[PDB]
């Protein structure tokens, strides 16, 4: 019950992708405030979506901020609850968790890190892969109703979408597939303003040297670069730092992250 | 009933399962959800009717065995054996008459003849093989020769539930080699898991090449010990890798039968064979109607009658005019 | 809740009893403080400052962060070819800082019963919210972070879901920034790109083989707990070391101390160092013949 | 007599069958019965506690959860397979024609048991068994001594095959097969035949493939290596072709005697068929001069097969007759069978 | 029956003592403690029980994760039971009784000497290496040509000073159960530290050490459970361990466990294998076998059988007595069996010459 | 006293009567396909004197394999338009419980109402799960439900003969199924749903655009060509994604850029250095 995310604004402040903010806005939040728009024209809202990664960041945040933006309604699901125990009884708990997900209207369903509990039947393994499919049956059954369907929005997330099997790879269950791209020039000044936040610096500065030296980075990685440059200030016993020592701490740490950037290639 | 109910009132009364019997008169009891129990005598019915694995009633108080109950062990197996094949006696088989004279002397000899083995000078045959493009009658002939031979027939894999009732760490086909001996002496078959997947025994060897060891070890006992004789097998395959079955068996000692493709002598009688269960007229000539289809498969014989029989099912009349008889041939010629 | 006491079949609860559960899941390992301190590493003073900072700065320097808007690092990736003395250096920094240490390993989260190590982080990070750092240290994050390519699944199943859950509660829940977690890997071959985040791995420094000055240092500073032989130039044993591990340098003084038994004298010479230095590496024990 | 009517009130009449978990030096014996229940059992009765060992079928009295004694264990479906003996129905009168091979290994199989005096003075001893190999029956060639070893001590035949036997592998229950048969007598002869590892069409179900079939064979080593086994369990391995055993595996065994039987010659084939037919001939009258002269050449395998169909085709006449046009025509089938693959080569 | 008479007749005092401790069912694990009197406990019945403890047991003896007795009526703690573990898995792990004493060595000196001082010497004289410390190494390794494998581990069995030690092989830990290996290696040292003096041994790490990663589908990743977790559990600091464990395998493979050990373990030796003058040492122990003629020269036949270790020349004195009874004679002169020895090397080299170079290559 | 019989069991049936789903008139032009369907559907439902006459015993077996594409449940609710009968709908995992004693009773209570009530149709989705064979004790209940599958298999011959049942079976992957389950004498008819290929293309674009908003302006001519090139397929419900990009609008009548953008993302093609021979 306690999951919370801001925005509205903080969702639109992520800087990209611009059209993806325009996606789940009217897909998720809009059905509650104006359900008449969809039913009059006759177009059905999507019953599912899939956000993968990480070509950049934003797989979770994109669906996460619009999750509590619909209303105070949300239900958060962690992949740790599906595995349960030996002879796991969570088959009725997946039904129980979704039963109390319908206690919240309109409901929203999350699934994160499905590359674990999404076990593939391609090469037939131990029966643990079978009970994975049984937990999938508990997911689909209640969402196949006979009950609230078009009103509830299910979300799943994965590292790579080769684990979905031909069932989840198909639309229906998993409908929308969206990836993330990089920002552009003069848009770097935009995403910058929202990354300013708590950390402040000298009065006369130009932030373009900071962010340009780090390209293709997580929003927290650039947030780390701002703090890493700010943690160099305490070594200089000053509140701010000149941009010459900035670019030093900016360039060094950034080039160290790029050597760890391997395995960004993901299957389609 | 009131006084007897007071005996059954406290805990009720249970039903146990005896895994083994002792001469000390203590009988082991086992309930399915519960653990194994054991109890002192407990003597009601004659002891000779009490055998391991048999179902027995259980009293609540002394936890003794009140009666003896008929169990089912062979019915389990035999029910799976009747799933794979119908009865299919000699009157249900035809066209193999040349081959049934080849197979009988192998099948009939250990059941009746064997005292003439030493006279004929040949060891007990290890089995028979039938190979050819399907085709049918290879399975129907299994229990056919065995029906008039008076010997009962047991069927084949998958088995498929013998991976629990018989343990996993157990030797499988060696444990099935026990089931054939536990049952009355019978005959076996190979069905089927012979597929076109690409070409190989790769997937068939699980239910075939491993059962090739079953025919050896069964007849090795029958020679050596236990009792009594009468254990046989029949192979069902098509083409290609049968030569590997001839590599496994260097001709010692296997009866020679080549399972034929559908033949004129085969289609003639095997048609009337399947027309005995249905009531039709005699106005149909079985001779020439079989010669117009020199090909396809033996299962097409049943495809003629049954599949095209739905057209006579369309007009709501038990019999149809000759115009449909040519249509019955016209349907089977489009798939050719 | 749960855990409350109630009497037999009367079904009355007298008092609501804490705290959570269960057995080793509640407390993975109880560690007071190590016998060693951060001073035990020679030549690493350049890359220990980055380490010491991220753990120490959120405690004493927190008051300066609210003024300047500074966010303390959470995860740190400490990796190098063994022996790098990583696990000794990590825990030793918790001795002087009073930080309560908790011992945990990656493969320890895999059990027969599914859903064990995954539920542990639900318990582990709940204590990270309850308790103040202190510290948590783990090892072999690279292996357990292996998603393969074609799944499912690996042998690391419970932990690869646990790690990405350990990474998830850092993402979705802001209060999780409490009780910074240290991670350690013995190889960079397999690295999850999701590990990049503020709450996730931030400080990363590649550990190469220490230089000739550092290799001579560490061998002396590992021996400060024991007797150190006099008459040592320290220059010859330093330059003769190429690619030799720091843990092997400890074995140099071992083998040189093992031969001291049969030699009859506990005193060692400067030539005995380079004797045990060339001993363990390159390889053993053969010699070059037939090679012209 | 009186003990039967005495302890019965002390244990029964009703009681349960549990399993043993662990034993404490305080005389409390922890037992576990279905399902998930423990207890402290202190009993001085009938034990025998040392011979028990855990995993046992030991009983648990109803009042209250005490073990009075044991009965027996069968056990499992696994034991019912072989049922002894095997008795010598494969006779030395079914084999013949091999001399230089039959003399040497006859000593090794008879080296234990009789003549113990110079065997114990040695003290190193070769209690490794033997090893066989080779197609088609080269491994079956000296199998006739294994059945000749059924006239005394005990014999065991274990089919190696390829697929059906899988398990973990870990080989947990096949060591049980070897152990339970040696508990009856304890001399032993253990025979393995037809290793298909090189000739596999594919891997079976979820095993491996590739190296996992190798590691269960490496476990087949570690079992057989082995630590720690002293007595016999005489190990005998056989196959059609062995590339399998690593240079490490042959060192424990068989480092002494492994056999190879060359293809038979005119002297062996005549001694093979005449001895095979010593029990039963066909129409008597059989002369072996023209039999080996007509077909040149092939192993004595198919010479029984052509004679199998000889009285079989004559059985259409229900006992005895020979048709000159039909017999040579029926012989043409097997004659061409070997005459399709006649050349190699010039195998030379 | 007379031994079973007084044996069965003791039930009179039994049933009197059977009433106490009868309620101990079942074994239950505790969870946490909010206060001193009351602890939460969980039992295998799946039902968790908060309860206080009887006045007979002190509260300080109850530690988190301790299985204790119970009174099914009052649910109160009765008596603690030390073992928490483990179902099966012990019988193949536990090894007892000696065999294969030191006299079975085949002449290798420096090899067996430096691996004797890693185990037998520190435990026989604990004060020695503690005062001489420095510090003992954290482990050893064994691999090479097969001779002599698995015997050097049997050497420490009969040379064992006080208490028997544990043997473990890789294929017994396969799954089925995952996580036993962790749980196992943790408890055996906890069981150790009480009595100390218990060695831990692992055999055949090559099959379970498959490294590193493949495309898919794994494959090696399920094998990473065996190699990486065992090395990680070896990589602890406690202490670690007191007995400094042991290692034995066939090939040096794979690279990852081979590069992990120098950071922890030490003393990697390569067999050795016989010296040209050391092949007669295996003939010395065999010179006591049966009756050896004094004309026999062991230095003559040693050179004729290269890379024979002690296994292949064990067949020499075997084939000696083998063909001795075949020929009905009694003793075996040198020229007698060596004529068969030149055959046993060549005729057994027709199919395979027994190279080890091709294994790792 | 026993039950009447019966009180039946838990869960539920029917729920397929809401309407509308699919009209059968699409195949009405052939009459070659419907003639075989007409004889295989309504006559096997209730007919009596016609069988014993000809002597052919109609099988109860219906096995549906071949997805993708979906097929299946369309023809299920379509039969509900054709005829009216009680539909038992349960997932293959629905009867998995914590105890193994209730399992044999549930599948017995499901099949005993099939012979009790007529006509009856029972639909179980993807039983290939429990078809997995594992002897382990923790999977013993998992193997206990596969013998339950073999139990209800023993119960499906109790329907023989002839009254009464209709057994429709559907599975996404039949490789894990046992040979005796697909063997005749129990299931004698294997209905293989064909791969969508070229045929199901144009039919499946037409059924979604009827549910889409008109499209009286939007001209389907260009969307049956360019998006048809990049189709995976990725056939049935990506056409729904083409409609789920209309809710992305922001536009009253779906723009041409909305459709084209939907299909071009999945799935990508990489050309052409090779197939250029065409
Ligand atoms: N004209 C159509 N052609 C194909 N499929 C359709 C059509 N109309 C609807 N569907 C799809 O059929 C689905 C219902 O089928 P069902 O409930 O049997 O699951 P399923 O499709 O078999 O699942 P899976 O594809 O994973 O096996 C609905 O989700 C719907 O999207
Ligand atoms: N660069 C170094 N600085 C200080 N000590 C070192 C260094 N390299 C090796 N050592 C010493 O070598 C010994 C072996 O420690 P090692 O580095 O193998 O642990 P580790 O590999 O970090 O452990 P883990 O694999 O669990 O991370 C330590 O006692 C340490 O003192
Ligand atoms: N555009 C952004 N603006 C502000 N903060 C951001 C932005 N992108 C990422 N972050 C920060 O990074 C953290 C992780 O965000 P996100 O969930 O998008 O990445 P992730 O999913 O953890 O990475 P991965 O996709 O590799 O798993 C969040 O706590 C958030 O504060
Ligand atoms: N020098 C020697 N002295 C005594 N015995 C020897 C010697 N060399 C070999 N042996 C004997 O040869 C036998 C065969 O060794 P074995 O093949 O079992 O080694 P291994 O365990 O396979 O080696 P690895 O584990 O490296 O594969 C051993 O039992 C050993 O006693």
PDB file of N, CA, C and O in Angstrom, chain C residues 3 8 18-19 22-23 29 83 91 105 107-108 111-112 140 148-150 155 186 247-248 251 255 284, chain E residues 31-32 34 50 65 73 177-178 182 186 215 217-218 221 225 229 232-233 237 260 262-263 266-268:
ATOM      1  N   UNK C   3       3.785 -12.649  15.032  1.00  0.00           N
ATOM      2  CA  UNK C   3       4.689 -12.856  16.163  1.00  0.00           C
ATOM      3  C   UNK C   3       3.984 -12.739  17.511  1.00  0.00           C
ATOM      4  O   UNK C   3       4.584 -13.082  18.533  1.00  0.00           O
ATOM      5  N   UNK C   8      -2.891 -21.264  23.840  1.00  0.00           N
ATOM      6  CA  UNK C   8      -3.527 -22.568  23.565  1.00  0.00           C
ATOM      7  C   UNK C   8      -4.768 -22.363  22.696  1.00  0.00           C
ATOM      8  O   UNK C   8      -4.693 -21.651  21.684  1.00  0.00           O
ATOM      9  N   UNK C  18       7.434  -7.994  18.985  1.00  0.00           N
ATOM     10  CA  UNK C  18       8.441  -7.863  17.924  1.00  0.00           C
ATOM     11  C   UNK C  18       9.602  -8.858  18.174  1.00  0.00           C
ATOM     12  O   UNK C  18       9.495  -9.562  19.178  1.00  0.00           O
ATOM     13  N   UNK C  19      10.643  -8.972  17.336  1.00  0.00           N
ATOM     14  CA  UNK C  19      10.818  -8.253  16.073  1.00  0.00           C
ATOM     15  C   UNK C  19      11.041  -9.203  14.894  1.00  0.00           C
ATOM     16  O   UNK C  19      12.081  -9.859  14.810  1.00  0.00           O
ATOM     17  N   UNK C  22      13.739 -14.345  10.440  1.00  0.00           N
ATOM     18  CA  UNK C  22      13.760 -15.555  11.268  1.00  0.00           C
ATOM     19  C   UNK C  22      15.166 -16.154  11.360  1.00  0.00           C
ATOM     20  O   UNK C  22      15.817 -16.364  10.337  1.00  0.00           O
ATOM     21  N   UNK C  23      15.615 -16.461  12.580  1.00  0.00           N
ATOM     22  CA  UNK C  23      16.853 -17.219  12.825  1.00  0.00           C
ATOM     23  C   UNK C  23      18.002 -16.527  12.089  1.00  0.00           C
ATOM     24  O   UNK C  23      18.311 -15.369  12.400  1.00  0.00           O
ATOM     25  N   UNK C  29      25.151 -12.660   9.901  1.00  0.00           N
ATOM     26  CA  UNK C  29      26.346 -12.947  10.680  1.00  0.00           C
ATOM     27  C   UNK C  29      26.568 -11.821  11.680  1.00  0.00           C
ATOM     28  O   UNK C  29      26.330 -10.649  11.379  1.00  0.00           O
ATOM     29  N   UNK C  83      45.597 -12.541  -4.874  1.00  0.00           N
ATOM     30  CA  UNK C  83      45.096 -11.719  -3.786  1.00  0.00           C
ATOM     31  C   UNK C  83      45.273 -10.225  -3.997  1.00  0.00           C
ATOM     32  O   UNK C  83      46.385  -9.767  -4.259  1.00  0.00           O
ATOM     33  N   UNK C  91      36.811  -4.810   5.683  1.00  0.00           N
ATOM     34  CA  UNK C  91      36.387  -4.985   7.069  1.00  0.00           C
ATOM     35  C   UNK C  91      37.234  -4.157   8.030  1.00  0.00           C
ATOM     36  O   UNK C  91      36.734  -3.687   9.060  1.00  0.00           O
ATOM     37  N   UNK C 105      27.688 -13.393   1.874  1.00  0.00           N
ATOM     38  CA  UNK C 105      28.235 -13.802   0.590  1.00  0.00           C
ATOM     39  C   UNK C 105      27.096 -13.991  -0.401  1.00  0.00           C
ATOM     40  O   UNK C 105      25.955 -14.276  -0.026  1.00  0.00           O
ATOM     41  N   UNK C 107      26.732 -16.349  -3.063  1.00  0.00           N
ATOM     42  CA  UNK C 107      26.235 -17.731  -3.177  1.00  0.00           C
ATOM     43  C   UNK C 107      25.536 -18.249  -1.927  1.00  0.00           C
ATOM     44  O   UNK C 107      24.842 -19.271  -2.015  1.00  0.00           O
ATOM     45  N   UNK C 108      25.696 -17.591  -0.775  1.00  0.00           N
ATOM     46  CA  UNK C 108      25.004 -18.030   0.434  1.00  0.00           C
ATOM     47  C   UNK C 108      23.499 -17.829   0.335  1.00  0.00           C
ATOM     48  O   UNK C 108      22.745 -18.352   1.164  1.00  0.00           O
ATOM     49  N   UNK C 111      19.500 -21.647  -1.914  1.00  0.00           N
ATOM     50  CA  UNK C 111      19.148 -22.839  -1.158  1.00  0.00           C
ATOM     51  C   UNK C 111      18.266 -23.721  -2.028  1.00  0.00           C
ATOM     52  O   UNK C 111      17.815 -23.310  -3.101  1.00  0.00           O
ATOM     53  N   UNK C 112      18.039 -24.955  -1.566  1.00  0.00           N
ATOM     54  CA  UNK C 112      17.111 -25.846  -2.256  1.00  0.00           C
ATOM     55  C   UNK C 112      15.744 -25.197  -2.415  1.00  0.00           C
ATOM     56  O   UNK C 112      15.189 -25.132  -3.517  1.00  0.00           O
ATOM     57  N   UNK C 140      31.764 -11.627  -4.455  1.00  0.00           N
ATOM     58  CA  UNK C 140      31.367 -12.330  -5.678  1.00  0.00           C
ATOM     59  C   UNK C 140      30.058 -11.782  -6.241  1.00  0.00           C
ATOM     60  O   UNK C 140      29.106 -12.528  -6.483  1.00  0.00           O
ATOM     61  N   UNK C 148      23.222 -14.519 -18.024  1.00  0.00           N
ATOM     62  CA  UNK C 148      23.524 -15.316 -19.216  1.00  0.00           C
ATOM     63  C   UNK C 148      23.245 -14.476 -20.462  1.00  0.00           C
ATOM     64  O   UNK C 148      23.528 -13.274 -20.505  1.00  0.00           O
ATOM     65  N   UNK C 149      22.693 -15.128 -21.482  1.00  0.00           N
ATOM     66  CA  UNK C 149      22.105 -14.487 -22.647  1.00  0.00           C
ATOM     67  C   UNK C 149      20.735 -15.110 -22.865  1.00  0.00           C
ATOM     68  O   UNK C 149      19.707 -14.435 -22.757  1.00  0.00           O
ATOM     69  N   UNK C 150      20.724 -16.406 -23.163  1.00  0.00           N
ATOM     70  CA  UNK C 150      19.497 -17.187 -23.230  1.00  0.00           C
ATOM     71  C   UNK C 150      19.191 -17.752 -21.848  1.00  0.00           C
ATOM     72  O   UNK C 150      20.008 -18.482 -21.273  1.00  0.00           O
ATOM     73  N   UNK C 155      22.654 -20.980 -12.324  1.00  0.00           N
ATOM     74  CA  UNK C 155      22.682 -21.577 -11.003  1.00  0.00           C
ATOM     75  C   UNK C 155      22.577 -20.529  -9.915  1.00  0.00           C
ATOM     76  O   UNK C 155      22.417 -20.843  -8.732  1.00  0.00           O
ATOM     77  N   UNK C 186      35.685 -10.507  -7.951  1.00  0.00           N
ATOM     78  CA  UNK C 186      37.017 -10.983  -8.297  1.00  0.00           C
ATOM     79  C   UNK C 186      37.298 -10.935  -9.793  1.00  0.00           C
ATOM     80  O   UNK C 186      38.434 -11.198 -10.202  1.00  0.00           O
ATOM     81  N   UNK C 247      49.097 -11.870  -2.124  1.00  0.00           N
ATOM     82  CA  UNK C 247      48.933 -13.037  -1.265  1.00  0.00           C
ATOM     83  C   UNK C 247      50.102 -13.999  -1.419  1.00  0.00           C
ATOM     84  O   UNK C 247      50.471 -14.702  -0.471  1.00  0.00           O
ATOM     85  N   UNK C 248      50.695 -14.046  -2.614  1.00  0.00           N
ATOM     86  CA  UNK C 248      51.878 -14.875  -2.815  1.00  0.00           C
ATOM     87  C   UNK C 248      53.080 -14.296  -2.083  1.00  0.00           C
ATOM     88  O   UNK C 248      53.990 -15.033  -1.686  1.00  0.00           O
ATOM     89  N   UNK C 251      53.145 -15.814   1.102  1.00  0.00           N
ATOM     90  CA  UNK C 251      53.680 -17.167   1.001  1.00  0.00           C
ATOM     91  C   UNK C 251      55.194 -17.164   0.845  1.00  0.00           C
ATOM     92  O   UNK C 251      55.846 -18.175   1.131  1.00  0.00           O
ATOM     93  N   UNK C 255      57.213 -19.804   3.012  1.00  0.00           N
ATOM     94  CA  UNK C 255      58.211 -20.751   2.525  1.00  0.00           C
ATOM     95  C   UNK C 255      59.605 -20.425   3.048  1.00  0.00           C
ATOM     96  O   UNK C 255      60.377 -21.338   3.364  1.00  0.00           O
ATOM     97  N   UNK C 284      55.964 -23.594 -11.361  1.00  0.00           N
ATOM     98  CA  UNK C 284      56.724 -24.576 -10.578  1.00  0.00           C
ATOM     99  C   UNK C 284      56.635 -25.925 -11.293  1.00  0.00           C
ATOM    100  O   UNK C 284      55.774 -26.098 -12.156  1.00  0.00           O
TER     101      UNK C 284
ATOM    102  N   UNK E  31      13.375 -17.675  16.471  1.00  0.00           N
ATOM    103  CA  UNK E  31      13.476 -16.621  15.464  1.00  0.00           C
ATOM    104  C   UNK E  31      14.147 -15.366  16.005  1.00  0.00           C
ATOM    105  O   UNK E  31      15.256 -15.036  15.574  1.00  0.00           O
ATOM    106  N   UNK E  32      13.510 -14.650  16.933  1.00  0.00           N
ATOM    107  CA  UNK E  32      14.064 -13.417  17.477  1.00  0.00           C
ATOM    108  C   UNK E  32      13.658 -13.289  18.941  1.00  0.00           C
ATOM    109  O   UNK E  32      12.921 -14.119  19.479  1.00  0.00           O
ATOM    110  N   UNK E  34      12.364 -10.128  21.590  1.00  0.00           N
ATOM    111  CA  UNK E  34      12.091  -8.755  22.005  1.00  0.00           C
ATOM    112  C   UNK E  34      12.518  -8.499  23.443  1.00  0.00           C
ATOM    113  O   UNK E  34      13.098  -7.447  23.735  1.00  0.00           O
ATOM    114  N   UNK E  50       5.437 -18.593  20.162  1.00  0.00           N
ATOM    115  CA  UNK E  50       6.072 -17.773  21.186  1.00  0.00           C
ATOM    116  C   UNK E  50       5.913 -18.472  22.527  1.00  0.00           C
ATOM    117  O   UNK E  50       4.836 -18.987  22.848  1.00  0.00           O
ATOM    118  N   UNK E  65      18.368 -19.314  16.361  1.00  0.00           N
ATOM    119  CA  UNK E  65      18.602 -20.479  15.537  1.00  0.00           C
ATOM    120  C   UNK E  65      18.934 -21.746  16.294  1.00  0.00           C
ATOM    121  O   UNK E  65      19.604 -22.624  15.737  1.00  0.00           O
ATOM    122  N   UNK E  73       1.984 -29.841  25.713  1.00  0.00           N
ATOM    123  CA  UNK E  73       0.965 -29.169  26.513  1.00  0.00           C
ATOM    124  C   UNK E  73       1.273 -27.681  26.657  1.00  0.00           C
ATOM    125  O   UNK E  73       0.555 -26.827  26.124  1.00  0.00           O
ATOM    126  N   UNK E 177      19.288 -31.379  -4.359  1.00  0.00           N
ATOM    127  CA  UNK E 177      19.488 -30.335  -3.367  1.00  0.00           C
ATOM    128  C   UNK E 177      20.572 -29.358  -3.800  1.00  0.00           C
ATOM    129  O   UNK E 177      21.682 -29.756  -4.163  1.00  0.00           O
ATOM    130  N   UNK E 178      20.243 -28.071  -3.765  1.00  0.00           N
ATOM    131  CA  UNK E 178      21.222 -27.002  -3.894  1.00  0.00           C
ATOM    132  C   UNK E 178      21.277 -26.260  -2.570  1.00  0.00           C
ATOM    133  O   UNK E 178      20.246 -26.074  -1.912  1.00  0.00           O
ATOM    134  N   UNK E 182      27.057 -25.265   0.804  1.00  0.00           N
ATOM    135  CA  UNK E 182      27.183 -24.133   1.714  1.00  0.00           C
ATOM    136  C   UNK E 182      26.928 -24.582   3.145  1.00  0.00           C
ATOM    137  O   UNK E 182      27.812 -24.487   4.002  1.00  0.00           O
ATOM    138  N   UNK E 186      29.832 -25.017   6.320  1.00  0.00           N
ATOM    139  CA  UNK E 186      29.723 -24.144   7.486  1.00  0.00           C
ATOM    140  C   UNK E 186      29.669 -24.963   8.772  1.00  0.00           C
ATOM    141  O   UNK E 186      30.270 -24.597   9.788  1.00  0.00           O
ATOM    142  N   UNK E 215      27.601 -18.720 -24.371  1.00  0.00           N
ATOM    143  CA  UNK E 215      26.469 -17.985 -24.923  1.00  0.00           C
ATOM    144  C   UNK E 215      25.155 -18.508 -24.355  1.00  0.00           C
ATOM    145  O   UNK E 215      24.484 -17.814 -23.585  1.00  0.00           O
ATOM    146  N   UNK E 217      22.345 -22.433 -24.319  1.00  0.00           N
ATOM    147  CA  UNK E 217      21.851 -22.162 -22.973  1.00  0.00           C
ATOM    148  C   UNK E 217      22.660 -22.938 -21.938  1.00  0.00           C
ATOM    149  O   UNK E 217      23.042 -24.085 -22.172  1.00  0.00           O
ATOM    150  N   UNK E 218      22.919 -22.308 -20.797  1.00  0.00           N
ATOM    151  CA  UNK E 218      23.685 -22.942 -19.739  1.00  0.00           C
ATOM    152  C   UNK E 218      23.024 -24.191 -19.182  1.00  0.00           C
ATOM    153  O   UNK E 218      21.835 -24.191 -18.864  1.00  0.00           O
ATOM    154  N   UNK E 221      26.654 -22.568 -16.278  1.00  0.00           N
ATOM    155  CA  UNK E 221      26.191 -21.681 -15.216  1.00  0.00           C
ATOM    156  C   UNK E 221      25.613 -22.461 -14.040  1.00  0.00           C
ATOM    157  O   UNK E 221      25.719 -22.032 -12.885  1.00  0.00           O
ATOM    158  N   UNK E 225      27.572 -23.211  -9.656  1.00  0.00           N
ATOM    159  CA  UNK E 225      27.156 -23.405  -8.271  1.00  0.00           C
ATOM    160  C   UNK E 225      28.198 -24.193  -7.488  1.00  0.00           C
ATOM    161  O   UNK E 225      28.439 -23.924  -6.306  1.00  0.00           O
ATOM    162  N   UNK E 229      30.933 -21.376  -5.478  1.00  0.00           N
ATOM    163  CA  UNK E 229      30.474 -21.347  -4.093  1.00  0.00           C
ATOM    164  C   UNK E 229      31.455 -22.058  -3.172  1.00  0.00           C
ATOM    165  O   UNK E 229      31.707 -21.605  -2.050  1.00  0.00           O
ATOM    166  N   UNK E 232      34.389 -19.795  -2.786  1.00  0.00           N
ATOM    167  CA  UNK E 232      33.961 -18.691  -1.932  1.00  0.00           C
ATOM    168  C   UNK E 232      33.903 -19.119  -0.472  1.00  0.00           C
ATOM    169  O   UNK E 232      34.359 -18.396   0.421  1.00  0.00           O
ATOM    170  N   UNK E 233      33.339 -20.300  -0.209  1.00  0.00           N
ATOM    171  CA  UNK E 233      33.304 -20.807   1.156  1.00  0.00           C
ATOM    172  C   UNK E 233      34.701 -21.140   1.663  1.00  0.00           C
ATOM    173  O   UNK E 233      34.959 -21.059   2.870  1.00  0.00           O
ATOM    174  N   UNK E 237      37.691 -16.351   6.283  1.00  0.00           N
ATOM    175  CA  UNK E 237      38.842 -16.084   7.135  1.00  0.00           C
ATOM    176  C   UNK E 237      38.916 -16.982   8.363  1.00  0.00           C
ATOM    177  O   UNK E 237      39.810 -16.792   9.193  1.00  0.00           O
ATOM    178  N   UNK E 260      42.062 -18.429  -8.655  1.00  0.00           N
ATOM    179  CA  UNK E 260      41.529 -18.028  -7.358  1.00  0.00           C
ATOM    180  C   UNK E 260      42.376 -18.543  -6.203  1.00  0.00           C
ATOM    181  O   UNK E 260      42.502 -17.862  -5.179  1.00  0.00           O
ATOM    182  N   UNK E 262      45.768 -18.974  -5.792  1.00  0.00           N
ATOM    183  CA  UNK E 262      46.978 -18.264  -5.336  1.00  0.00           C
ATOM    184  C   UNK E 262      46.678 -17.123  -4.380  1.00  0.00           C
ATOM    185  O   UNK E 262      47.524 -16.792  -3.540  1.00  0.00           O
ATOM    186  N   UNK E 263      45.496 -16.513  -4.481  1.00  0.00           N
ATOM    187  CA  UNK E 263      45.098 -15.509  -3.513  1.00  0.00           C
ATOM    188  C   UNK E 263      44.821 -16.076  -2.138  1.00  0.00           C
ATOM    189  O   UNK E 263      44.883 -15.342  -1.148  1.00  0.00           O
ATOM    190  N   UNK E 266      48.024 -22.359  -1.304  1.00  0.00           N
ATOM    191  CA  UNK E 266      49.453 -22.379  -1.591  1.00  0.00           C
ATOM    192  C   UNK E 266      49.846 -23.837  -1.801  1.00  0.00           C
ATOM    193  O   UNK E 266      48.999 -24.736  -1.765  1.00  0.00           O
ATOM    194  N   UNK E 267      51.137 -24.063  -2.032  1.00  0.00           N
ATOM    195  CA  UNK E 267      51.708 -25.403  -2.170  1.00  0.00           C
ATOM    196  C   UNK E 267      51.024 -26.177  -3.302  1.00  0.00           C
ATOM    197  O   UNK E 267      50.272 -27.129  -3.093  1.00  0.00           O
ATOM    198  N   UNK E 268      51.298 -25.718  -4.520  1.00  0.00           N
ATOM    199  CA  UNK E 268      50.882 -26.423  -5.723  1.00  0.00           C
ATOM    200  C   UNK E 268      52.061 -27.237  -6.242  1.00  0.00           C
ATOM    201  O   UNK E 268      53.081 -26.674  -6.655  1.00  0.00           O
TER     202      UNK E 268
END
